[PDB]
Ligand binder design. Structure first.
Ligand SMILES: CCCSc1c(F)c(F)c(S(N)(=O)=O)c(F)c1F
Ligand SMILES: [Zn+2]
Length: 258
């Protein structure tokens, strides 16, 4: 593709092909907790996912995705800031080249070692992801900051699957999996209107950022960085990082549920 995370094709240069990279609703952001506004109309987040909607795991060159069947409302996110039901379609991670950084969102300047994104589309209003993806109210993404520490057992099925999708474009069945098992036990959150965090960078996402982190070990992070961005039979090029820097808030308000 014309974009990636290298020096030449990376975030700093994305605006050349994708001008919205310099938009007013870009993500991720730094959440400054002294500038959050507690909002009492925010309802609790409700997730209800059916593990039979898990579909496939794919290496996309810059990351890997776990996609879900989204033909119906078997797996849905509701509550929080939403009046609409949002249908689960994918989860994935971001990571950095070492443990020091790797999250996309930061909290009061603090960088975590990775970040989980659980992505949903507005099926009350739209008929497909493709329709929803560019609408201001189209997408809802839960982000969970991942703090290097104890190995997290709940990552296991994901990590065990990586050996079948080592290189760009490989894909395999990934079934019977409920990604609510990856979320932290408190679902207290921050929410703000923003964007996809890589091209096409659409400003279509209501972000739900969990206040509590989940763990990951330094060895489970290495399993992500050992995926390869090349296709089979080319020079091996590890996927060292895929996090975008934080972007200017431009007057947006981050709301706290707590
Ligand atoms: C156009 C159809 C959506 S592609 C996409 C996406 F689904 C995400 F969840 C994200 S993210 N990483 O903001 O969750 C993303 F950056 C994307 F580009
Ligand atoms: Zn993401």
């Amino acid at each position: 593709p014309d974009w990636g995370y290298d020096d030449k094709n990376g975030p700093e240069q994305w605006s050349k092909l994708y001008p919205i990279a310099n938009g007013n609703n870009q993500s991720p952001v730094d959440i400054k907790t002294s500038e959050t506004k507690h909002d009492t109309s925010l309802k609790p987040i409700s997730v209800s996912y059916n593990p039979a909607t898990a579909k496939e795991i794919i290496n996309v060159g810059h990351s890997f995705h776990v996609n879900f069947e989204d033909n119906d409302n078997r797996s849905v996110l509701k509550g929080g800031p939403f009046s609409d039901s949002y249908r689960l379609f994918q989860f994935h991670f971001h990571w950095g080249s070492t443990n020091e950084h790797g999250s996309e969102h930061t909290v009061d300047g603090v960088k975590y070692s990775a970040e989980l994104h659980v992505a949903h589309w507005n099926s009350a209003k739209y008929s497909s992801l493709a329709e929803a993806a560019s609408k201001a109210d189209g997408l809802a993404v839960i982000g969970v900051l991942m703090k290097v520490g104890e190995a997290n057992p709940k990552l296991q099925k994901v990590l065990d699957a990586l050996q079948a999708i080592k290189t760009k474009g490989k894909r395999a069945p990934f079934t019977n999996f409920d990604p609510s098992t990856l979320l932290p036990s408190s679902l207290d959150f921050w929410t703000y209107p923003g964007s996809l965090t890589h091209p096409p960078l659409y400003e279509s996402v209501t972000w739900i950022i969990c206040k509590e982190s989940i763990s990951v070990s330094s060895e489970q992070l290495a399993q992500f960085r050992s995926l390869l961005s090349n296709v089979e039979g080319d020079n091996a090029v590890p996927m060292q990082h895929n996090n975008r820097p934080t972007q200017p808030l431009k007057g947006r308000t981050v709301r706290a549920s707590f």
